[PDB]
Amino acid sequence: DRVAASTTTNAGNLVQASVAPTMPVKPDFKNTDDFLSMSYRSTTAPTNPTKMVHLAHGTWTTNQHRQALVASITLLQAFWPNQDFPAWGQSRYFAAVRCGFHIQVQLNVNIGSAGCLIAAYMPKTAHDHMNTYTFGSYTNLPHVLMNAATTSQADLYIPYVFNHNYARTDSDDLGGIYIWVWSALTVPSGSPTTVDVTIFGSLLDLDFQCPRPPGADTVIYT
Amino acid sequence: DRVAASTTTNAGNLVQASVAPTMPVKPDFKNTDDFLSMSYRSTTAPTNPTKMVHLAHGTWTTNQHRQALVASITLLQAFWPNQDFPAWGQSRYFAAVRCGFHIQVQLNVNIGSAGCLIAAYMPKTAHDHMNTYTFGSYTNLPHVLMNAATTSQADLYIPYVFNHNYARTDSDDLGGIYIWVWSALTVPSGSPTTVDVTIFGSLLDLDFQCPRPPGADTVIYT
Amino acid sequence: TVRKTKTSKFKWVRNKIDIAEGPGAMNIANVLSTTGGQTIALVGER
Amino acid sequence: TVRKTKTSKFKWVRNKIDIAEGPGAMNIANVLSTTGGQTIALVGER
Amino acid sequence: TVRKTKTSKFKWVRNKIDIAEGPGAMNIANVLSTTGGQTIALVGER
Amino acid sequence: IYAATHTKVDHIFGRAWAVGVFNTETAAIQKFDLHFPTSTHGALSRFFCHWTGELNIHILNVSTTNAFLKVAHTWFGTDSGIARTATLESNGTMIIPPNEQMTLCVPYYSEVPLRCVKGSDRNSAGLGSLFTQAVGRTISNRVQIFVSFRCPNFFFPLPAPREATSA
Amino acid sequence: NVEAAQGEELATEVGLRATENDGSLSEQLNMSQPMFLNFKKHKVNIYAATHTKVDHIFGRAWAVGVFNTETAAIQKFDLHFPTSTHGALSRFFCHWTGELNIHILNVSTTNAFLKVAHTWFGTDSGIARTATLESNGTMIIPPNEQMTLCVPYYSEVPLRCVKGSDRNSAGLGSLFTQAVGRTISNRVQIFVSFRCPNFFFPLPAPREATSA
Amino acid sequence: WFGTDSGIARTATLESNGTMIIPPNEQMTLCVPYYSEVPLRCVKGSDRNSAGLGSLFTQAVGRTISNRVQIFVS
Amino acid sequence: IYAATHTKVDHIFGRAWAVGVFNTETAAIQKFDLHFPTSTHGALSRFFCHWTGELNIHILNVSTTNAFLKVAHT
Amino acid sequence: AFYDPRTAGAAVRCKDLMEIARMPSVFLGESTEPDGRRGYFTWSHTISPVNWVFDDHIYLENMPNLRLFSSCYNYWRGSFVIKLTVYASTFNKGRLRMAFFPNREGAYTQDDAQNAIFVVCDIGLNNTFEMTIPYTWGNWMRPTRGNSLGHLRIDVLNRLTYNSSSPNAVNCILQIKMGDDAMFMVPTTSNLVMQ
Amino acid sequence: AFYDPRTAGAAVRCKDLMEIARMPSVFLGESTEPDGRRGYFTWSHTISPVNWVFDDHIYLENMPNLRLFSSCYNYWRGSFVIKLTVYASTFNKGRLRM
Amino acid sequence: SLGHLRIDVLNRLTYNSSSPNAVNCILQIKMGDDAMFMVPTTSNLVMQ
């Protein structure tokens, strides 16, 4: 009949006049199941939000000139805009993100077409103003050029880059990848005009902090 | 320009005609932030659903006789009936539960009252029928008696016990804790009549498996 | 059982199995079969 | 099979074969046969 | 008995138990089963 | 007082117990369902929900007119989602001679690793469902069937069950 | 880090494969199946024995044919490979060679002995060899009783083919019986089980025949 | 060894008490172990409780009549 | 092709052969004479005059009404 | 007798018949017509990104090879490997992904892919895309012919881009290869004939 | 088959089922009413020293747990341990004997 | 019968103003250490 404390993750329990616990006869608390009824690895559940997901496809046609914008992605708000995405449910609690980013631009061009899209990365405080930047210089950014011919995929890794130490989930704070027309495509006839572009993203180095009520926004850095 | 494969958790990506990846100049991909803007441990997020939560309080008065039921908890459906609970968001994806259980029955009796409630544990296939069981024998179950006087808290640990190997989240499959009146309470005057009972639960040995669409149910064992 | 020793106990054993040729037909002539036999003596003493 | 080891496995074995003399006739008098017998005890304990 | 030795004599033994597969069906063709058999000779001499 | 112990789980359920009696005059396949024991020493097993172990079946054939009868057992019921009862020859049939009986035991095959004693639900609850049919153009072939466990494993207890006067 | 994985060499392992180069069909058996970051491939044996192994599966017998015999005349009874049962699992293979058990089950209202004899060649070897079945391997079966007698492989065709119905080389045999002891309504039932079968070469999975 | 009445009627079904089934036109040697609340039976007395050397139960099955038995004690 | 040889004298005559069938309704002693085999694989023995060896006899009893029957050879 | 394997195509006798299950079989491929749910389907450019080319349940009883193999055994374990195959010119290029919810019916919204296994992959010099799905149950084994094994959805990430020298639309084929570890259990008869 | 205990609450199989008999059971506790011979009874101050609060036979067939356990076996040996339990405030004091 | 157990008052319950007037009590029969059971037998009861 003494003081018993109990602590799990955030919550904690300080009890007075405790009673010794009970357990069923011959208990076995080993978590894993052997033999296995599931082939998956038991670390799946926490790992799951890291899964790579289709993101914001766009359609790039003839008519669009240079400097035009094919598609747009707001980076940090991109992985859970809806309830459908895997990282949503667990991001609907914790209010901050230290996470790094992995985005793989998928593209398919029918052989015999020529032109280029550029996949760049613009952080938020940069993204605030397009009007300042010369177009010819966008290659200063972390980026990858994509040739129509002989490029299936463009793999670019983005480390966390932002002013404040931690960034708010529900906002745009990480900025986002914007895909621009480096040169117009050239189509011989007959060919399908629209060349579909799908930005197939991912996420790595998962982090969350600073609990909040499920639906409510909270200010942190400002 | 070769074959590049990419695999994260469940998803995987098989690319042809790949291009070597890019990264910003002098990248540092170390996840943690030193110095720290947050005192929390970075393992918080996956651990979070294990947090102990208030569960289904009940009110035990004079009038209720013996064998009466103070409060009822359906074990596995108990930790995420609503969106508010911490384990909900991450259980709204994965469809199976191997998890073990930790439940601490909280109770407060004004000194000078006498009586007992019993905290038992009934698995589902047992719970199907109350009518079969003699009351005087419920102590065969894994349980803890609770004396009115000199018991603050009752700590009982429940290992996973169920027919099928894995159990469905959204259902009652683990059965549940039911709290019964072992003897009527005896109140001198004046005293508050109602003695409030709150079952303050928790969860341990977290597990999830078998992905499903977010809102849809899926059969597994039956 | 996660822990089970590997022995003949996989197969739970059985009673031993045999086959009968003659279905209990008596033989008079042969002396060998005739000599051995059930005694109505107590503890078959001589 | 061009390659087969020469063993008792030519003949595929069999169940062993026996002959019954008395076709299950009970014997009262003899003490020896009387002593041994089926027990209705559990695990035939004494 | 205050004094009893602990042996197989707890269980009072038994007659050994077997199982019959074929219930005494004759087999013609097979030479092996055919060779062995009851002799009507005296002491089965050759 | 005795060398052996009647209290030990292994020994006590060695003694078999009688579940069901029926005459069979028809060659049609007979559906016969096995509940856990009631109203006998087998009811001592009523303390446990989860049970797993192989179980003996002693069937006893009585035929006025000479008849062979067949025995086959299926843990899954008549319906596996298809009708698998079309012919019982392939499912483990063991043929029983007339006026005779055999000890054949059934191994544990189940998609549910632990049977629960209490429930009557045909899917996972029962300890099985038994199939038979007569052969040899006969009638009034009467059987009686006995169920005995072998090295049972009982898991988790329950309170002592109420006697049901009203059923 | 922990979550991500990359190429470009091992994209073979992540499941990208060219079907145009299969190597041998048996070379695909060696192929390691693809796996993502989380899957645990572990072979878990719930039973000691394997029901998948060829040896075990055909141990369970299966019922082919039922007929009453009221006449002492020699009965021609032909054995096809199994249909509509677990024996039909053998329908994948053409060429088959191995000895096979025959479980016959005698039912006699009036006491009757019945005889069993098997001939791989049919009724006609070019002469009628069915004149008397005593010499061809007869094994006599008592009334109301059954026996396990197995037939050795005697054939002028080293490999039986399962599919074909052609009486010469296709079937797995042709079975002879006759009653004795002046009786009628002696009814038999006969079961066929293989022993240590050898199946050679596969075939595609056969169509279910609704029209027969 | 205890009679019909142990204080309750235990004769409801004899299957569980050590039943051993006997085929038709046949006989068996089955022996009974000693189970008694009285360590020593007395031969003389006829009193059903502790005196006798036992009480024997049987029933026929298979819808028959004129099934005749004879029983020997050694 | 086979381990055993069907050609060997020992093996070939192992397979028995059927000589004679008769019903017996009368307790009177039945004279039944055994010739060497004709019209069967036993007729393979017809190449030799002089023969000596012990021989099996498989008799098969069929009785509608229960009857014991005796066998003796001279 | 001494059996003679050499007359046969394979010198060594087949020890385990599981190796037949490992052989791929076209899903529901009994149809001559190219479309659209039958497992032999037509990838067309008439459809925008994110729309189903192929959506259906897969019962274990639909696939031809395992169909009889299912009637023989009641239960089975072990992972799938199910492989999609596109046939196109070296010119033709496009990317499509395969979403699979084990144990599901009437699935998705067509919007929700994630929280389900999927392989995004591209047409090229290589074609067959294999992906493995471990078995998922609370039970230590599952019924063979029985409840749905779950949807696989095939949708467009990027529409087929056809050239003047290149075909307009390509025909594709699904094949279910049985896994490495897959056991079958407790043999049982069925009502079907010839299988 | 290899049986799977870990799915069950207890990892180790129950060797002797005697351990169930060791579990306490309320005597004749089938009653909701507090009084007076039913094994669930009321200790009251309305009664002077040396008067029965509880008096009844105990058959082995009255106690719920052993009631079926009694129907299964005819005979038994071994000692009892029978335990009385009073529930009162830390204030309340009194002495009663059995 | 296994015999009576009698429960009587040595000293009456002394109740306070903050304390209950009368208390409810419970008897429990726990089976002993060494207790064997013997010679299994059927009974007429149902469900037990």
Side-chain angles (χ1 to χ4, degrees), chain G residues 169-202:
Chain G
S169 64
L172 62 310
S174 64
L175 182 287
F176 288 157
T177 53
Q178 68 175 18
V180 59
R182 62 173 69 90
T183 57
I184 61 171
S185 178
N186 190 31
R187 183 175 183 171
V188 307
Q189 186 170 356
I190 178 170
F191 298 155
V192 173
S193 178
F194 302 157
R195 183 182 185 275
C196 293
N198 304 346
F199 287 94
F200 295 151
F201 182 82

Short mmCIF file of all heavy atoms in Angstrom, two decimals, chain G residues 169-202:
data_model
loop_
_atom_site.label_atom_id
_atom_site.label_comp_id
_atom_site.label_asym_id
_atom_site.label_seq_id
_atom_site.Cartn_x
_atom_site.Cartn_y
_atom_site.Cartn_z
N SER G 169 -2.70 -48.16 -73.65
CA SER G 169 -1.69 -47.63 -72.75
C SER G 169 -2.14 -46.54 -71.79
O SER G 169 -1.39 -46.15 -70.90
CB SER G 169 -0.51 -47.09 -73.56
OG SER G 169 -0.92 -45.99 -74.35
N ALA G 170 -3.36 -46.03 -71.95
CA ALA G 170 -3.73 -44.82 -71.22
C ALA G 170 -4.16 -45.06 -69.78
O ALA G 170 -3.68 -44.40 -68.87
CB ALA G 170 -4.82 -44.09 -71.97
N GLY G 171 -5.06 -46.01 -69.57
CA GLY G 171 -5.62 -46.22 -68.25
C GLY G 171 -4.57 -46.66 -67.25
O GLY G 171 -3.46 -47.00 -67.63
N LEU G 172 -4.92 -46.63 -65.97
CA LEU G 172 -4.02 -47.15 -64.96
C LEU G 172 -4.37 -48.60 -64.66
O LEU G 172 -3.80 -49.20 -63.76
CB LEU G 172 -4.04 -46.30 -63.68
CG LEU G 172 -5.24 -46.06 -62.75
CD1 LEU G 172 -6.47 -45.61 -63.48
CD2 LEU G 172 -5.54 -47.26 -61.87
N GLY G 173 -5.32 -49.15 -65.40
CA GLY G 173 -5.58 -50.58 -65.29
C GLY G 173 -7.00 -51.03 -65.59
O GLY G 173 -7.88 -50.23 -65.87
N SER G 174 -7.20 -52.34 -65.52
CA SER G 174 -8.51 -52.94 -65.74
C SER G 174 -8.72 -54.05 -64.73
O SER G 174 -7.88 -54.95 -64.61
CB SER G 174 -8.62 -53.48 -67.15
OG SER G 174 -7.70 -54.53 -67.35
N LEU G 175 -9.83 -54.01 -64.01
CA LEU G 175 -9.98 -54.84 -62.82
C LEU G 175 -10.99 -55.98 -63.01
O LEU G 175 -12.10 -55.77 -63.48
CB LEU G 175 -10.37 -53.94 -61.65
CG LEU G 175 -10.58 -54.46 -60.22
CD1 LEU G 175 -11.85 -55.26 -60.04
CD2 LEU G 175 -9.35 -55.23 -59.77
N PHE G 176 -10.59 -57.19 -62.62
CA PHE G 176 -11.43 -58.38 -62.72
C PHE G 176 -11.88 -58.95 -61.38
O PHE G 176 -11.09 -59.02 -60.44
CB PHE G 176 -10.71 -59.49 -63.49
CG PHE G 176 -10.59 -59.23 -64.95
CD1 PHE G 176 -9.60 -59.84 -65.69
CD2 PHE G 176 -11.46 -58.37 -65.58
CE1 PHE G 176 -9.49 -59.60 -67.03
CE2 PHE G 176 -11.36 -58.14 -66.93
CZ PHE G 176 -10.36 -58.75 -67.66
N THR G 177 -13.14 -59.37 -61.31
CA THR G 177 -13.71 -60.00 -60.12
C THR G 177 -14.76 -61.05 -60.46
O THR G 177 -15.41 -60.98 -61.50
CB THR G 177 -14.38 -58.97 -59.19
OG1 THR G 177 -15.32 -58.19 -59.94
CG2 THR G 177 -13.37 -58.06 -58.54
N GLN G 178 -14.94 -62.03 -59.58
CA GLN G 178 -16.11 -62.90 -59.63
C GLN G 178 -16.48 -63.42 -58.25
O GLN G 178 -15.61 -63.72 -57.44
CB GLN G 178 -15.91 -64.07 -60.58
CG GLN G 178 -14.88 -65.08 -60.14
CD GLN G 178 -14.82 -66.29 -61.05
OE1 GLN G 178 -15.29 -66.24 -62.18
NE2 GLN G 178 -14.24 -67.38 -60.56
N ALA G 179 -17.77 -63.53 -57.99
CA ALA G 179 -18.27 -64.09 -56.75
C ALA G 179 -18.21 -65.61 -56.78
O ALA G 179 -18.14 -66.21 -57.84
CB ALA G 179 -19.69 -63.63 -56.49
N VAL G 180 -18.21 -66.23 -55.60
CA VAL G 180 -18.26 -67.69 -55.51
C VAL G 180 -19.12 -68.04 -54.29
O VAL G 180 -19.30 -67.22 -53.40
CB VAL G 180 -16.84 -68.28 -55.42
CG1 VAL G 180 -16.12 -67.74 -54.21
CG2 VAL G 180 -16.87 -69.79 -55.35
N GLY G 181 -19.65 -69.26 -54.25
CA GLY G 181 -20.50 -69.67 -53.15
C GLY G 181 -22.00 -69.52 -53.36
O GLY G 181 -22.74 -69.34 -52.40
N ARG G 182 -22.42 -69.58 -54.62
CA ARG G 182 -23.83 -69.54 -55.04
C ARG G 182 -24.64 -68.42 -54.36
O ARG G 182 -25.55 -68.68 -53.58
CB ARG G 182 -24.53 -70.90 -54.82
CG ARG G 182 -24.62 -71.45 -53.39
CD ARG G 182 -25.46 -72.71 -53.31
NE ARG G 182 -24.84 -73.86 -53.96
CZ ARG G 182 -24.03 -74.71 -53.34
NH1 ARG G 182 -23.77 -74.55 -52.05
NH2 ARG G 182 -23.50 -75.73 -53.99
N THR G 183 -24.32 -67.18 -54.69
CA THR G 183 -25.00 -66.06 -54.05
C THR G 183 -25.48 -64.98 -55.01
O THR G 183 -25.19 -65.01 -56.20
CB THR G 183 -24.09 -65.37 -53.04
OG1 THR G 183 -22.89 -64.94 -53.70
CG2 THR G 183 -23.74 -66.32 -51.91
N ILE G 184 -26.19 -64.01 -54.45
CA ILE G 184 -26.68 -62.85 -55.19
C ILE G 184 -26.54 -61.63 -54.30
O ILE G 184 -26.28 -61.74 -53.10
CB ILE G 184 -28.14 -63.01 -55.65
CG1 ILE G 184 -29.07 -63.19 -54.44
CG2 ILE G 184 -28.29 -64.16 -56.65
CD1 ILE G 184 -30.54 -63.14 -54.79
N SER G 185 -26.72 -60.46 -54.91
CA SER G 185 -26.71 -59.19 -54.19
C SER G 185 -25.46 -59.02 -53.35
O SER G 185 -25.48 -58.35 -52.32
CB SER G 185 -27.95 -59.06 -53.30
OG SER G 185 -27.91 -57.83 -52.58
N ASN G 186 -24.38 -59.63 -53.80
CA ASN G 186 -23.09 -59.38 -53.19
C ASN G 186 -22.62 -58.06 -53.75
O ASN G 186 -22.44 -57.93 -54.96
CB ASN G 186 -22.11 -60.50 -53.50
CG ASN G 186 -20.85 -60.39 -52.69
OD1 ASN G 186 -20.87 -59.90 -51.56
ND2 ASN G 186 -19.74 -60.83 -53.25
N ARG G 187 -22.43 -57.08 -52.88
CA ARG G 187 -22.13 -55.74 -53.35
C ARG G 187 -20.73 -55.34 -52.96
O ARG G 187 -20.31 -55.56 -51.83
CB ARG G 187 -23.14 -54.74 -52.80
CG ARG G 187 -22.93 -53.33 -53.31
CD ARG G 187 -24.02 -52.41 -52.83
NE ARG G 187 -23.86 -51.07 -53.39
CZ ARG G 187 -24.75 -50.10 -53.27
NH1 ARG G 187 -25.88 -50.32 -52.61
NH2 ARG G 187 -24.53 -48.92 -53.82
N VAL G 188 -20.00 -54.75 -53.90
CA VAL G 188 -18.63 -54.35 -53.62
C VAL G 188 -18.48 -52.86 -53.80
O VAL G 188 -19.29 -52.21 -54.46
CB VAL G 188 -17.64 -55.07 -54.52
CG1 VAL G 188 -17.86 -56.55 -54.42
CG2 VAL G 188 -17.81 -54.63 -55.94
N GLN G 189 -17.43 -52.32 -53.20
CA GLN G 189 -17.03 -50.95 -53.43
C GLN G 189 -15.52 -50.93 -53.42
O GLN G 189 -14.90 -51.57 -52.57
CB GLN G 189 -17.61 -50.02 -52.38
CG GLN G 189 -17.33 -48.56 -52.68
CD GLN G 189 -18.11 -47.64 -51.78
OE1 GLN G 189 -18.92 -48.08 -50.96
NE2 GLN G 189 -17.89 -46.34 -51.94
N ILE G 190 -14.93 -50.21 -54.36
CA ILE G 190 -13.51 -50.34 -54.60
C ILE G 190 -12.82 -48.99 -54.57
O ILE G 190 -13.29 -48.02 -55.15
CB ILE G 190 -13.29 -51.06 -55.93
CG1 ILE G 190 -11.81 -51.17 -56.25
CG2 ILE G 190 -14.04 -50.38 -57.04
CD1 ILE G 190 -11.54 -52.09 -57.41
N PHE G 191 -11.69 -48.93 -53.87
CA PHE G 191 -10.96 -47.69 -53.67
C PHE G 191 -9.55 -47.80 -54.22
O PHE G 191 -8.89 -48.82 -54.06
CB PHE G 191 -10.90 -47.36 -52.18
CG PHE G 191 -12.24 -47.13 -51.56
CD1 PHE G 191 -12.43 -47.34 -50.21
CD2 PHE G 191 -13.31 -46.74 -52.32
CE1 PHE G 191 -13.66 -47.14 -49.64
CE2 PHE G 191 -14.54 -46.54 -51.75
CZ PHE G 191 -14.71 -46.74 -50.41
N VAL G 192 -9.07 -46.74 -54.87
CA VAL G 192 -7.76 -46.77 -55.49
C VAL G 192 -6.83 -45.72 -54.89
O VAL G 192 -7.09 -44.53 -54.98
CB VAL G 192 -7.86 -46.56 -56.99
CG1 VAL G 192 -6.48 -46.43 -57.58
CG2 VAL G 192 -8.58 -47.72 -57.63
N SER G 193 -5.74 -46.18 -54.30
CA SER G 193 -4.75 -45.27 -53.75
C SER G 193 -3.35 -45.58 -54.26
O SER G 193 -2.92 -46.73 -54.25
CB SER G 193 -4.74 -45.33 -52.23
OG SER G 193 -3.74 -44.49 -51.69
N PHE G 194 -2.64 -44.55 -54.70
CA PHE G 194 -1.29 -44.72 -55.23
C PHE G 194 -0.30 -44.96 -54.10
O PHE G 194 -0.60 -44.66 -52.95
CB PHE G 194 -0.87 -43.49 -56.02
CG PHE G 194 -1.78 -43.15 -57.15
CD1 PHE G 194 -1.84 -41.88 -57.66
CD2 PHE G 194 -2.61 -44.11 -57.69
CE1 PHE G 194 -2.69 -41.57 -58.69
CE2 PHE G 194 -3.46 -43.81 -58.72
CZ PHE G 194 -3.50 -42.53 -59.22
N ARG G 195 0.86 -45.52 -54.42
CA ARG G 195 1.94 -45.61 -53.44
C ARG G 195 3.26 -45.16 -54.04
O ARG G 195 3.73 -45.73 -55.02
CB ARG G 195 2.08 -47.03 -52.91
CG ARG G 195 3.15 -47.13 -51.84
CD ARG G 195 3.34 -48.54 -51.34
NE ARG G 195 4.28 -48.57 -50.23
CZ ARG G 195 5.60 -48.62 -50.37
NH1 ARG G 195 6.14 -48.65 -51.58
NH2 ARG G 195 6.38 -48.63 -49.30
N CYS G 196 3.87 -44.15 -53.42
CA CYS G 196 5.10 -43.53 -53.92
C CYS G 196 5.08 -43.30 -55.42
O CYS G 196 5.90 -43.85 -56.15
CB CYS G 196 6.31 -44.38 -53.55
SG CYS G 196 6.65 -44.44 -51.77
N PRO G 197 4.14 -42.47 -55.90
CA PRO G 197 3.95 -42.22 -57.32
C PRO G 197 5.14 -41.52 -57.92
O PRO G 197 5.83 -40.80 -57.21
CB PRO G 197 2.73 -41.31 -57.36
CG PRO G 197 2.05 -41.52 -56.07
CD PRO G 197 3.16 -41.71 -55.10
N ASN G 198 5.39 -41.71 -59.21
CA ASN G 198 6.37 -40.90 -59.88
C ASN G 198 5.67 -40.17 -61.01
O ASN G 198 5.29 -40.79 -62.00
CB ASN G 198 7.51 -41.75 -60.43
CG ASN G 198 8.18 -42.58 -59.37
OD1 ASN G 198 7.98 -42.36 -58.18
ND2 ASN G 198 8.98 -43.55 -59.79
N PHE G 199 5.50 -38.86 -60.89
CA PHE G 199 4.86 -38.11 -61.96
C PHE G 199 5.87 -37.36 -62.79
O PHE G 199 6.74 -36.68 -62.27
CB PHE G 199 3.82 -37.14 -61.40
CG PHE G 199 2.58 -37.81 -60.90
CD1 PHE G 199 2.44 -38.15 -59.58
CD2 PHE G 199 1.55 -38.11 -61.77
CE1 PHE G 199 1.30 -38.77 -59.13
CE2 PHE G 199 0.41 -38.72 -61.32
CZ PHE G 199 0.28 -39.05 -60.00
N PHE G 200 5.74 -37.50 -64.10
CA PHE G 200 6.69 -36.91 -65.02
C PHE G 200 6.01 -35.94 -65.96
O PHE G 200 4.96 -36.25 -66.54
CB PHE G 200 7.39 -38.01 -65.82
CG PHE G 200 8.24 -38.91 -64.99
CD1 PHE G 200 8.46 -40.22 -65.37
CD2 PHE G 200 8.80 -38.45 -63.81
CE1 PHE G 200 9.23 -41.06 -64.60
CE2 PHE G 200 9.58 -39.29 -63.04
CZ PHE G 200 9.80 -40.59 -63.44
N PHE G 201 6.61 -34.76 -66.07
CA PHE G 201 6.24 -33.72 -67.02
C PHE G 201 4.90 -33.11 -66.64
O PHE G 201 3.97 -33.83 -66.29
CB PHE G 201 6.22 -34.33 -68.43
CG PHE G 201 5.90 -33.37 -69.52
CD1 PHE G 201 6.88 -32.56 -70.04
CD2 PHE G 201 4.63 -33.31 -70.06
CE1 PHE G 201 6.61 -31.69 -71.07
CE2 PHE G 201 4.35 -32.45 -71.09
CZ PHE G 201 5.34 -31.63 -71.59
N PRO G 202 4.77 -31.78 -66.75
CA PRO G 202 3.48 -31.18 -66.42
C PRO G 202 2.61 -30.91 -67.64
O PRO G 202 3.07 -31.04 -68.76
CB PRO G 202 3.88 -29.89 -65.73
CG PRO G 202 5.17 -29.53 -66.33
CD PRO G 202 5.87 -30.80 -66.69
#
